[PDB]
Design a protein around this ligand. Structure first.
Ligand SMILES: C=CC1=C(C)[C@@H](Cc2[nH]c(/C=C3N=C(/C=C4\NC(=O)[C@H](C)[C@H]4CC)C(C)=C\3CCC(=O)O)c(CCC(=O)O)c2C)NC1=O
Ligand SMILES: C=CC1=C(C)[C@@H](Cc2[nH]c(/C=C3N=C(/C=C4\NC(=O)[C@H](C)[C@H]4CC)C(C)=C\3CCC(=O)O)c(CCC(=O)O)c2C)NC1=O
Ligand SMILES: C=CC1=C(C)[C@@H](Cc2[nH]c(/C=C3N=C(/C=C4\NC(=O)[C@H](C)[C@H]4CC)C(C)=C\3CCC(=O)O)c(CCC(=O)O)c2C)NC1=O
Ligand SMILES: C=CC1=C(C)[C@@H](Cc2[nH]c(/C=C3N=C(/C=C4\NC(=O)[C@H](C)[C@H]4CC)C(C)=C\3CCC(=O)O)c(CCC(=O)O)c2C)NC1=O
Ligand SMILES: C=CC1=C(C)[C@@H](Cc2[nH]c(/C=C3N=C(/C=C4\NC(=O)[C@H](C)[C@H]4CC)C(C)=C\3CCC(=O)O)c(CCC(=O)O)c2C)NC1=O
Ligand SMILES: C=CC1=C(C)[C@@H](Cc2[nH]c(/C=C3N=C(/C=C4\NC(=O)[C@H](C)[C@H]4CC)C(C)=C\3CCC(=O)O)c(CCC(=O)O)c2C)NC1=O
Ligand SMILES: C=CC1=C(C)[C@@H](Cc2[nH]c(/C=C3N=C(/C=C4\NC(=O)[C@H](C)[C@H]4CC)C(C)=C\3CCC(=O)O)c(CCC(=O)O)c2C)NC1=O
Ligand SMILES: C=CC1=C(C)[C@@H](Cc2[nH]c(/C=C3N=C(/C=C4\NC(=O)[C@H](C)[C@H]4CC)C(C)=C\3CCC(=O)O)c(CCC(=O)O)c2C)NC1=O
Ligand SMILES: C=CC1=C(C)[C@@H](Cc2[nH]c(/C=C3N=C(/C=C4\NC(=O)[C@H](C)[C@H]4CC)C(C)=C\3CCC(=O)O)c(CCC(=O)O)c2C)NC1=O
Ligand SMILES: C=CC1=C(C)[C@@H](Cc2[nH]c(/C=C3N=C(/C=C4\NC(=O)[C@H](C)[C@H]4CC)C(C)=C\3CCC(=O)O)c(CCC(=O)O)c2C)NC1=O
Ligand SMILES: C=CC1=C(C)[C@@H](Cc2[nH]c(/C=C3N=C(/C=C4\NC(=O)[C@H](C)[C@H]4CC)C(C)=C\3CCC(=O)O)c(CCC(=O)O)c2C)NC1=O
Ligand SMILES: C=CC1=C(C)[C@@H](Cc2[nH]c(/C=C3N=C(/C=C4\NC(=O)[C@H](C)[C@H]4CC)C(C)=C\3CCC(=O)O)c(CCC(=O)O)c2C)NC1=O
Ligand SMILES: C=CC1=C(C)[C@@H](Cc2[nH]c(/C=C3N=C(/C=C4\NC(=O)[C@H](C)[C@H]4CC)C(C)=C\3CCC(=O)O)c(CCC(=O)O)c2C)NC1=O
Ligand SMILES: C=CC1=C(C)[C@@H](Cc2[nH]c(/C=C3N=C(/C=C4\NC(=O)[C@H](C)[C@H]4CC)C(C)=C\3CCC(=O)O)c(CCC(=O)O)c2C)NC1=O
Lengths: 257, 164, 69, 177, 164, 177, 177, 164
C-alpha cells in the first residue's frame, strides 16, 4: 500500500455536495474536472473531419495533376460566389431543427458501417465521432461519382426515371406545404441565379468523362443503391442493376432534400 | 427476396470478395431444416382447398357489419373474390417453407399492403382474424411433427406483426 | 543453380517449377519374422531428381563416340 | 438474388397454383448432394491465387500481340486492371454455384457487357480464350486429376458437378456476343 | 469480426428489421460445425510450439539464400523474428477456428501486411512456403477427424490465396 | 459487431496466448444451449407488434399527464415517433440474445442517447418504466408463463436466460438516464 | 493414409513424411498383400540406378544412330537428360505400385509427355523401346528371376503384382505412342 | 501526364482564371533546364544497347537465387523476357527526361506495378538491384556532366522510392 491511507483525489469529477447550492455554484460543481476531455475529443473529431476530406481528393488529383472534376470556375471570378454559397449555407445547416440533429447523427452511424465493409477498427471510430461519419459519407460518395452531378442519363427514358424519384425525394425537403431553410438557393440579390449559372457548368463538363470514367462509375453506383436502399427489394434491384442513374440520384442520407 | 443463402452472398459481394469459411457454415444449417420444414409445406399443399373455405367464413362469422350494404362485401361474387384473397396469402406462405427464409413474404404480402387496404377500406383487423384462425388451431402431434409445428406458426404470425 | 533452358514450348505443359520432381522412398524391413520391430521405417519424401552429369560421361564414352556437338 | 430453392418458385409465381409434392422431389435430391456442393466450392476458393494468374498467362503464351505496341493491356495501368477484369468473373460464378442458378451472375454483372466492352475497344476474340483456360481448370479441380494439387475428399461421383460449371461459363461468351 | 453471426446481424441491422428466422437457420449450422472445428483448435493449442519450429525449417530449405547479407536472415536476432512472425499467423489461425469465421485473420494479420513486407524487403514467397509445408504433411485420419482436416486446412490456404 | 465468439478471443488477444480447454468448455456449453437459444429469440420476434403497442398505452395508464396538452406524448406524430422508437431498443436486445453479447446495442443505440433526449426534452422517468414494462414480457416468453400465448417447448429450465435477458434491459435505462 | 501419402507428391512443394513402428501396422491392415507389396517396390528402387543404365544402353545396342552427331543421345548434357528422365518414370511407377493405382502417375508424369517429346525432337519409337526394357526389368525383380543379382524374400507368389506393374508401363507406353 | 507546363496550366482552368503571369514565370524555369537536361536523353538513347546487358547482368549477381526453380527466374523466358522487362523502365526515363516531369513513369510505370508483382510473384527487390546499379556506376567526369548527374540520378531515385 502507498501511504497511511488512499483517499480519492480532489481533481476527480463529482466530488462536492450539489444539494442546496446556488445556480452559479451548482454548475461550477458538476463540471469540475470534465472540461479537458470534452475539448480533447472536440478537436479530435474535427481533425478526423479534416483528414478524410483530404484522402479522397488524392483520387481527384491523381499523380499531381488536376482533372476535369475540380473545375470551380468557368468565367472571370466564377469561384467567389461559389465561395460564399458553400460557407453561408454551412451556417444555415447549423441552425436546423432539433429533430434533424440526431437524425443526422444516427443515420450517419447507419450508412458508414455498411460502407466500411467489415473492418472492426473502422466502425469503432464511427460510433464515437459524429463529425467523422458526416465526412466519411460525402467524401467517398463524391470520390466515387455517385450523387447528382456525374450520373448523366444515356437513354431517353432515364430523364424521367430521374425526375420521378427526385420530386418524390423532395418530400424530405418540404415538411408540408411550407418550404424549409435547409433548401435555400442563396440570400444575395444575384445569388439565386448565381447558383444556377454554376449548376449548368458543373453538369455539362462532367458529361465529358473518358470511356473508363463512365464504365467504372456505372457499376459503382449500382452496388451503392444495392446496399443502401434495396437490401432485399429485388424489384428495386431490377432497375438498380441495369439502370444506374436510378441507383444514384436517390441519396442515402436524410439530407432534407 | 431474402432467404438463408441468397442473403449471405448478397453480403459476400457487398465487401467484394469470395465466400469465406463461415459462409459455408450457414448453408449447412438449412440442410438441417430442409426435412423438418418441407413436411410443413406438404401439409399445407394437400389441404389448402379445405382451409380456404374453413378460415374464410371464420372472419365473416366475426364482423356482422359487412353483411349489410355500405361495404364492399354486399353480394356473393365479392365473397367469392374474398376467398380468392385468402388463396394468395396461402400461396406464398407455402413458398417460404420451400426456400427456408422470409423471402416471398416481405415482397407481396408485407410491403405495399398499407395503401390498398386502407384507402380501399378493407380493414387489416379483418385479415388478422383469419390469419390467427389458422394459427390458433395447430394440432402439433397430429398434422405435422413437433418441429414443423412450431415454425409453421412462426411464418403465420409474420403478417400478424406486420399488418396489425 | 540451374540455368534456364527455357524455350517456353513445353512451358505450358510441365511448368518452370514442376519439372523433374519425383517421389523418393526408403525401406527398412523388420529384423526377424513375426516380431514387432520399432526400427522398421519408411520414407516417402518428394525430391527433385538432379541432372547427374557424372555417369553421363562414362556411359556415352563406353558406347559410341565423342558427344561434343 | 434467387436460388435453386427459388427456381421452382420462379415457375410457381406464374402457375396460379402451388409447389408441393409435385416438385419437392427435384429439390429433395439437391439436399442429398448438398454436402457435395459445399465440398466442391472448397476447391475453387482453395486456389484463388492460381485461377486468375495462369489464365492471363494462358493467352500470352498463345496470342502475345496484346502487350505489343498497340496493345489493350500494354502498360501496368491496363493489365493490372485486366487481372481485376478476370477475377470478378471468378467471383460472380462462385456465388452462382451455391445458388444453383445464374440469377446472381446474369443481373449483377453480366447484364449487357457489350456497352462497356465495345465502348472501350476490349478484344472480345481472346476474351473467350481467357474463359476456357479457367473452365478447363475448373473441371480439372472438381475431379482430383489436377497434376499439381491433389485434394482429400470423400469418394463418389461428381460428373453432375463437373458438367454444371462448364454450363456456367458458356453464357459468358453469349453475354459478349 | 467477420463471423457468420456478424454477417447475418449486420444485414439484419441494415434493413431496420428484427432477427428473422432465416438467420436462425445459419445459427443451427454453427452448432453442427462447431464440434468439428473446435477440436481443430484444441489440438492446435497443445501442438503450437512443435508445429511452428517444424514449419520454418522448410522456409530455409526451399529458399536457403536468405542467410546471405542484405537478406532477411543474415543474423540470429531476425531469424528469431522469423519464427515470431510465423507464430503470430498460426495463433490467428487458432483464433479464427474458435470464432468460426475469418474475422481475426483478415483484420489483424492480413490487412496492412502487403505494404510492410515489400517495405522491409520481405518476400511473401517464403511466407507461403512456411504454411504450405504445415498444411501438407498432416494425415486427415491420423491427427484429427475427417472434418477438421478439411475445415482447418481450408483456413491455411486462405492465407496463400490472399498473399499471392 | 462483437458477438460471443469474438468476445472470448478479444480478452484473450491481450493474453498473447492461445485458447485451449480452460474456457472452451464454457463456450462448448454455450453451443450446447444454442438450440435453446434459438428456442429463446423465437419467442421475442414472434410477439413484436403486441408488446411495442402494449407499453405505449401502459406507460400512460400509470401517467395520464403524458397525453395532456403540452405533453411529450401528446400528439399523433409524437406517439407515431414513439412507437417507431419503441421496437428499435427491443430489436437490438434481440440481436444481443441471438449473438450472445451486449456489444451491438451499446454502440449503435446507447451511443449517446442521453445526449439526444436532453436535446428534445424527452422524459427519462417515463422511458425507464416503459422498458421495464417491456422487460417482464421478455422473461414471460422465454419462460412460457404468458397468460394468452403458449409456445410448445421441450422440458427444461429457462432461468439460464431469465436473468440474462433482464441483464440486457437494466443496462439500457442506466445509460440513457 | 494413402490420401495423406498422395498429398506429399501432388501438393506442388516438397514435404516429408515417414512411418514409424506403430503405423506400419496401419499400412498392413489397409493395403491387401502389403508384405508382398512393400517387398516388391523395395526391389525396384534399390536397383533403379542400374536399371536406368541398361535401359538407355539397350536402346543404343539395338539403335546406335542415337549417339550419331545430330542424334538425340549426342551432346552429353542431352544424354544426361535421358538419364534424368529414365528414372522419373521408375520413380513414379514405383509410386503407382505403392498407391495401388496409377491416377497420380497420369496427371503428374504422363500428362503432356506426348506433345513435349515432339516439341523437343525426341524419337518416340525409341522411347517406347526404352520403357519396354524397364517393363521387362521390373518383372524380373518382382518375381526375382533376374540373372545377375537376386534378392532375399519370404517365399510365396508375387505374380499378381508383376501383372499389376505390367499394367503400369503400357500406360507410359500408350501415352507416348 | 506530369510536366512543368501541364501541371501549372491545370490550376488556371481548375480555378477558372486566365493564364496568370506566375505560370508565365514557370515555363521560363523550363528554359533553364532545356539545354541542361536533354543532353542526358540523347546520351542514353545511344547508350542503352550496352547498359541493358551490364545492368541486366547486375541483378543476377545479387540474386543467383532468383534463378532456380519456384521463383521469378524459373526459366530463361522471364529473362529473355527479363531483359525486355528492364528495357521498359529506362525506356521511360528517355521519355521522362525529355518532357521535364515524371509523367511517363507515374502513369505508365508505377500505376498498378505492385499488383502485377504480387500476383505474378516477381520480386521487386531485384529491380532495386537492376537500375540502381547504374546509379553506383555513373561517372560525372567521363560519361556526362554533373547536370545529368543531378537529374538522371534524381529520376532513378524516384523509382526505387516507388518500387519499394
Ligand atoms: C476515485 C478514483 C480515483 C482514481 C482511479 C484516480 C484517478 C487518477 N489518476 C491520476 C493520475 C495517474 N494515474 C496513473 C495510473 C496508471 N497509468 C498507467 O500507466 C497505468 C495504466 C495506471 C496504473 C497501473 C498514472 C501514471 C498517473 C500520473 C500521475 C502524474 O501525472 O504524475 C489522476 C490525476 C492526479 C491526481 O489527481 O492526483 C487521477 C484523478 N484518482 C482518483 O481519485
Ligand atoms: C479518420 C479515420 C480513418 C479511417 C477509419 C480509415 C477509413 C478508410 N480506409 C480507407 C482504405 C482502406 N481501409 C482498409 C482497411 C480495411 N479494409 C479491409 O479490407 C479490412 C477488412 C479493413 C481493416 C480491418 C484497407 C485495406 C484500405 C485500402 C483499400 C481501400 O481503399 O478500400 C480509406 C480510403 C483511403 C483513400 O481514400 O486513399 C478510408 C477513408 N481512414 C481514415 O483516415
Ligand atoms: C424507384 C425506385 C424506388 C426505391 C429505391 C424505393 C425508395 C423508397 N422507399 C420508400 C418507402 C419504402 N420502401 C420500402 C421498401 C420495400 N418495400 C417492399 O415491399 C420491398 C420488400 C422493399 C423494396 C421495394 C418500404 C417497406 C417502405 C415504407 C417505409 C418507409 O416509408 O420508409 C419511399 C417513399 C414512399 C414512396 O415510395 O412513395 C422511397 C422513395 N422506392 C422506390 O419507388
Ligand atoms: C395445413 C394446416 C391444417 C391444419 C392446422 C388443420 C386445421 C383444421 N382442423 C380441422 C378439424 C378439427 N380440428 C380439431 C381440433 C383439434 N384436434 C385435436 O385433436 C386437438 C384437440 C385440436 C387441435 C388443437 C378437431 C377435434 C377437428 C375435427 C372435428 C371438429 O372439431 O369439427 C379442420 C376442418 C376440416 C377437418 O374436418 O379436418 C381444419 C381446417 N387442417 C389443415 O389442413
Ligand atoms: C515433373 C515431371 C517431369 C517429367 C515427366 C520429366 C519429363 C521431361 N523431360 C524433359 C527433357 C528431356 N528428356 C529427354 C529424354 C530423351 N530424349 C530422347 O531422345 C530419348 C528417347 C530420351 C532419353 C532416354 C531429353 C534429351 C530432354 C532435353 C531436351 C533438350 O535438351 O533438347 C523435360 C524438359 C522440359 C522442362 O524442363 O519442362 C521434362 C519435363 N522431367 C520432369 O521433371
Ligand atoms: C516396411 C517394410 C516391409 C517390407 C519390405 C515387407 C517385408 C516382409 N515381407 C514379409 C512376408 C512376405 N513377403 C512376400 C513377398 C515376396 N515373396 C516372394 O516370393 C516374392 C518374390 C516377393 C513378392 C515380390 C510374401 C509372399 C510373404 C508371405 C505372405 C505375407 O506375409 O504377405 C514379412 C514377414 C516375414 C516374417 O514372417 O517374419 C516381412 C517383414 N514387410 C514390411 O513390413
Ligand atoms: C499460356 C501460359 C500458361 C500458364 C500461365 C500456365 C497456366 C495454366 N494452367 C492450366 C491448367 C491448370 N492450372 C491449374 C492452376 C493452379 N493449380 C494450383 O494449385 C494453383 C492454385 C493454380 C495456379 C496458380 C490446375 C490445377 C490445372 C489443371 C492441371 C494442369 O494442367 O496442370 C491452363 C489451362 C489451359 C487452357 O487455357 O485451356 C493454363 C493456361 N499454363 C500455360 O500454358
Ligand atoms: C462448412 C464447410 C463445409 C465443407 C468444406 C464441405 C465439406 C464436406 N464434404 C463432404 C462430402 C463429399 N464431398 C464429395 C465430393 C467429392 N468427392 C470426390 O471424390 C470428388 C473429387 C468430389 C466431387 C467434386 C463426396 C462424393 C462426398 C460424400 C457425400 C456424398 O457422397 O454425397 C461432407 C460430408 C461428410 C460428412 O458430413 O460426414 C462435408 C461436410 N461441407 C461443408 O459443410
Ligand atoms: C500481429 C501480427 C504480426 C505479424 C504478422 C508480424 C509482422 C511483422 N514482421 C516484422 C518483422 C520481420 N518479420 C520477419 C520474418 C520473416 N522474414 C523472413 O526472412 C521470413 C520470410 C520471415 C520468417 C519466416 C523478419 C526477419 C523481420 C525483421 C525485419 C526488420 O525488422 O527489418 C514487423 C516489424 C516489427 C518487428 O520486427 O517486430 C512486423 C509488424 N508482426 C506482428 O506483430
Ligand atoms: C393501467 C394500464 C395498464 C395496461 C394497458 C396494461 C398493460 C401491461 N401489460 C403488462 C404485462 C404483460 N404484457 C404482455 C404482452 C402481451 N401479453 C400477451 O399475452 C400478448 C402476447 C401480448 C400483447 C399482444 C405480457 C406477456 C405481460 C406479462 C404477463 C402479464 O402480466 O400479463 C404490463 C407490465 C406490468 C409491470 O409494470 O410489471 C403493463 C403495464 N397493464 C396495466 O396496468
Ligand atoms: C431455426 C430455428 C430453430 C429453433 C426455434 C429451434 C427449435 C428447437 N428447440 C429445441 C429444443 C429445446 N428448446 C428448449 C427451450 C425451452 N424449453 C423450455 O422449457 C423453455 C420454455 C424454453 C427455454 C428457452 C429446451 C429445454 C430444449 C431441449 C434441448 C436442450 O435441453 O438442450 C430443438 C431440439 C429438439 C428437437 O430436435 O426436436 C429444436 C430443433 N432450433 C432451431 O434450429
Ligand atoms: C494441431 C495441428 C497438428 C498437425 C497438422 C500435425 C502436424 C505434425 N506432425 C508431426 C509429426 C509427424 N508427421 C508425420 C507425417 C505423417 N505421419 C504419418 O503417419 C504419415 C506418413 C504422414 C501423414 C500422411 C510423421 C511420420 C511424424 C512423426 C515424426 C517422424 O517420425 O518422422 C508433428 C510433430 C509432433 C511429433 O513430435 O511427432 C506435427 C506438429 N500435428 C499436429 O499437432
Ligand atoms: C549393348 C547392348 C545392350 C543390350 C541389348 C542390353 C541388354 C538387355 N538386358 C535386359 C534385361 C535386364 N536388365 C536388368 C538390369 C540389371 N540386372 C541387374 O541385376 C542389375 C541390378 C541391373 C543393371 C545391370 C534385368 C534385371 C534384366 C532382366 C533379366 C536379365 O536379362 O538379366 C534387356 C531387357 C529384356 C529384353 O531383352 O527384352 C535388354 C534389352 N544392355 C546392353 O548394354
Ligand atoms: C510497359 C510496361 C511493362 C513493365 C513495367 C514491365 C513489367 C512486366 N514484366 C512482365 C513479365 C516478366 N518480367 C520478368 C522480369 C523479372 N522477373 C524476375 O523475377 C526479376 C525481378 C526480373 C528479371 C529482370 C520476367 C522473368 C517475366 C516473365 C514472367 C511472365 O510474365 O510469365 C510483364 C507481363 C507481360 C510481359 O511479359 O511484358 C510485365 C507487365 N514489362 C512491361 O512490358
Amino acid at each position: 500500500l502507498t501511504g497511511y491511507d488512499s483517499k480519492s483525489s480532489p481533481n476527480f469529477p463529482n466530488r462536492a455536495a450539489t444539494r442546496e447550492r446556488r445556480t452559479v455554484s451548482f454548475n461550477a460543481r458538476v463540471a469540475r474536472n470534465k472540461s479537458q476531455a470534452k475539448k480533447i475529443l472536440e478537436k479530435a473529431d474535427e481533425f478526423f473531419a479534416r483528414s478524410v476530406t483530404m484522402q479522397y481528393k488524392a483520387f481527384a488529383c491523381p499523380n499531381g495533376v488536376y482533372d476535369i472534376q475540380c473545375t470551380e470556375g468557368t468565367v472571370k471570378g466564377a469561384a467567389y460566389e461559389k465561395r460564399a454559397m458553400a460557407v453561408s449555407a454551412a451556417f444555415r445547416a447549423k441552425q436546423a431543427s432539433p429533430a434533424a440533429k440526431a437524425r443526422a447523427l444516427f443515420e450517419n452511424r447507419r450508412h458508414a458501417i455498411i460502407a466500411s465493409h467489415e473492418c472492426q477498427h473502422e466502425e469503432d471510430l464511427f460510433v464515437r465521432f459524429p463529425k467523422l461519419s458526416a465526412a466519411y459519407m460525402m467524401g467517398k460518395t463524391e470520390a466515387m461519382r455517385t450523387c447528382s452531378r456525374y450520373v448523366v442519363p444515356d437513354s431517353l427514358e432515364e430523364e424521367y426515371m430521374a425526375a420521378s424519384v427526385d420530386r418524390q425525394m423532395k418530400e424530405r425537403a418540404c415538411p408540408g406545404g411550407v418550404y424549409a431553410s435547409s433548401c435555400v438557393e442563396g440570400n444575395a440579390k444575384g445569388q439565386a441565379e448565381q447558383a444556377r449559372v454554376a449548376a449548368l457548368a458543373t453538369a455539362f463538363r462532367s458529361a465529358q468523362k473518358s470511356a473508363s470514367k463512365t464504365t467504372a462509375e456505372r457499376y459503382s453506383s449500382a452496388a451503392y443503391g444495392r446496399d443502401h436502399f434495396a437490401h432485399g427489394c429485388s424489384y428495386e434491384e431490377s432497375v438498380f442493376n441495369t439502370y444506374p442513374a436510378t441507383a444514384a440520384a436517390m441519396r442515402s442520407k436524410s439530407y432534407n432534400y | 427476396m431474402k432467404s438463408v443463402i441468397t442473403t449471405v452472398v448478397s453480403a459476400a459481394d457487398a465487401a467484394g470478395r469470395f465466400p469465406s469459411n463461415s459462409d459455408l457454415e450457414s448453408i449447412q444449417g438449412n440442410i438441417q431444416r430442409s426435412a423438418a420444414r418441407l413436411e410443413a409445406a406438404e401439409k399445407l399443399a394437400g389441404n389448402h382447398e379445405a382451409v380456404v373455405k374453413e378460415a374464410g367464413d371464420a372472419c365473416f362469422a366475426k364482423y356482422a357489419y359487412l353483411k349489410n350494404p355500405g361495404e364492399a362485401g354486399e353480394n356473393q361474387e365479392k365473397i367469392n373474390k374474398c376467398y380468392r384473397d385468402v388463396d394468395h396469402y396461402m400461396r406464398l406462405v407455402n413458398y417460404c417453407l420451400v426456400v427456408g427464409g422470409t423471402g416471398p413474404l416481405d415482397e407481396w404480402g408485407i410491403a405495399g399492403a398499407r395503401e390498398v387496404y386502407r384507402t380501399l377500406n378493407l380493414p387489416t383487423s379483418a385479415y388478422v382474424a383469419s390469419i390467427a384462425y389458422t394459427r390458433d388451431r395447430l394440432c402439433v402431434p397430429r398434422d405435422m411433427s413437433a418441429q414443423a409445428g412450431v415454425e409453421f406458426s412462426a411464418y403465420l404470425d409474420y403478417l400478424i406483426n406486420a399488418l396489425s | 543453380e540451374p540455368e534456364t533452358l527455357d524455350d517456353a514450348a513445353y512451358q505450358r505443359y510441365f511448368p518452370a517449377r514442376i519439372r523433374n520432381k519425383a517421389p523418393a522412398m526408403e525401406f527398412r524391413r523388420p529384423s526377424f519374422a513375426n516380431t514387432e520391430d520399432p526400427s522398421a521405417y519408411f520414407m516417402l519424401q518428394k525430391e527433385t531428381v538432379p541432372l547427374r552429369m557424372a555417369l553421363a560421361e562414362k556411359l556415352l564414352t563406353k558406347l559410341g563416340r565423342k558427344g561434343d556437338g | 438474388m434467387l436460388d435453386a430453392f427459388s427456381r421452382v418458385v420462379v415457375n410457381s409465381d406464374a402457375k396460379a397454383a402451388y409447389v408441393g409434392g409435385s416438385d419437392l422431389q427435384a429439390l429433395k435430391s439437391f439436399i442429398a448432394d448438398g454436402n457435395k456442393r459445399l465440398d466442391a466450392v472448397n476447391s475453387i476458393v482453395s486456389n484463388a491465387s492460381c485461377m486468375v494468374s495462369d489464365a492471363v498467362s494462358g493467352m500470352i503464351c498463345e496470342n502475345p500481340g496484346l502487350i505489343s505496341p498497340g496493345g489493350n493491356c500494354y502498360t501496368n495501368r491496363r493489365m493490372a486492371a485486366c487481372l481485376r477484369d478476370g477475377e470478378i468473373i471468378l467471383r460472380y460464378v462462385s456465388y452462382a454455384l451455391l445458388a444453383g442458378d445464374a440469377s446472381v451472375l446474369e443481373d449483377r454483372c453480366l447484364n449487357g457487357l457489350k456497352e462497356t466492352y465495345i465502348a472501350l475497344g476490349v478484344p472480345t476474340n481472346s476474351s473467350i480464350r481467357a474463359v476456357s483456360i479457367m473452365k478447363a481448370q475448373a473441371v480439372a479441380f472438381i475431379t482430383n486429376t489436377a497434376t499439381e494439387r491433389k485434394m482429400s475428399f470423400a469418394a463418389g461421383d461428381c460428373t453432375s458437378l463437373a458438367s454444371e460449371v462448364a454450363s456456367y461459363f458458356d453464357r459468358v461468351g453469349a453475354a459478349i456476343s
